[PDB]
């Protein structure tokens, strides 16, 4: 993985591995997501980054995930090489803006495009803040100037409002609990994790006779590693479409929110 | 990756990623145990296999792990690059074994080992059977014939029969369910899976203040997808601990384990 020439982005290549597969013997959106994670991260490191900065460390400041837009035009097999181009840009006070790029390696044909909404928080309050200037000022040096968008269209589908799916939900995958591998390194449930219990409650006959085409997920509340999730979904629509919603088994309080398109293979 | 100079083992390089280390920004036996399985595929794969030869394939036959034998000296950092070497070897009419050996690429030094015995299963009825000549001559020559051992010690670590955890267990963590990123490309629950289910019910004090060196896991039977699993763990002391996973159920037997962890 490098920077770019002009130090305004980062790729990386990835050859897809035996149990990153599915059914189809191509890459899991999960797996997808994982390799955004990874290629992400290994861009604030190339920066001298860690993605918080001195003064955010200082005033125990994190970034956390508002929302996850990916669209998959075709999910590379078992032993392809995947590339992931990767930047982020400010968005101003409100918070910041990573976008990727994934192209086949071998014809360079545009294969995926990801973006995702970042917002700052206090780790121990758990208490959003505006970006101050100094912060904004230390990003800006790694961010084009010029606006560098996955998803240009000016109304595109990454930035609807999610409605709350209304009980009775149409499907529902219940008492979903995270364990060790679902974890990252400070003990979290990693954003992933919720991707994938999102996906439980779709039925397996969607799975076996559809492909995953977009996926939109807002991050509302993290899921406490001795927390109980409930998975629920319900279709609202040859595309097939889903409204989602991950709550805690007991009270009922929302974690998350989605929408997933699907096409017919 | 590539076949050695003599075509008889792999070698692989792996760079550690951000998502695969635990608290410590060290790799977790999970992580480890899907590279032995990563490069284990890409052995099959660069001579020809499925790891099913056409005549297995035809009488509906494949391997499956009986027993996981990992020894850890150091997991890797976030961001180093390990090398794994593998390997496999007859064991007779039995069954075949696997075995693996990490080092660091940077030193050169052994960071881990790793042995497994497969067995040959009827896809379909589940049934053991023993290898015949005919499916063990089309293996022979991608295989050393001397002996070579990750483990060589006569009678060792990896070769003691594990005992049944009693009831009641010391420890438990009850109600555990695979999701779809458990499965494989053939919808089956991935053997990693059943490593992580075993360590589970360690408590998080001796995650938190030992570190894991030695696994040995039985496969005994599948949980389907829709099976529900409890994982039992008893103290049998560095500490040790015997392990068992059942079905929540009818308490059928689908793994039996034992783990030691050192002090940091
Ligand atoms: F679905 C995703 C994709 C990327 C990430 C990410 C990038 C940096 N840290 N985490 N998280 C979830
Ligand atoms: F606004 C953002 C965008 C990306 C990241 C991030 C986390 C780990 N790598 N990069 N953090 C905040
Ligand atoms: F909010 C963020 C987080 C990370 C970055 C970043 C990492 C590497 N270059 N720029 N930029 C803004
Ligand atoms: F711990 C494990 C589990 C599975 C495997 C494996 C190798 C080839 N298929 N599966 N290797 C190590
Ligand atoms: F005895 C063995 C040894 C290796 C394997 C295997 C499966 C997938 N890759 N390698 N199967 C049985
Ligand atoms: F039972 C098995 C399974 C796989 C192999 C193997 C794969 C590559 N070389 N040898 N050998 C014996």
New interface residues.
Partial sequence: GSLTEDGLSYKEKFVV???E???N?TA?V?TIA?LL??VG??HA?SVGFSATTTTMRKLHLIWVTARMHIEIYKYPA??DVVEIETWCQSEGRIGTRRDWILKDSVTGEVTGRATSKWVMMNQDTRRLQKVSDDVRDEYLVFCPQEPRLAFPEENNRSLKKIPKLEDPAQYSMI???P???D?????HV?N?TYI??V??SIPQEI?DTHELQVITLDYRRECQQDDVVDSLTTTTSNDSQFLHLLRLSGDGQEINRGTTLWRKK
Wanted: charged share 25%; proline share 0%; aromatic share 8%.
């Fill in positions: 591995r035996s149990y597969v599915g059914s013997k899991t999960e994982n994670q990874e991260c290994n490191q078992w032993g008492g979903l609990k364990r060790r591998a974890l990252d390194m400070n003990q990693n992933v994938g219990w996906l439980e799975v």
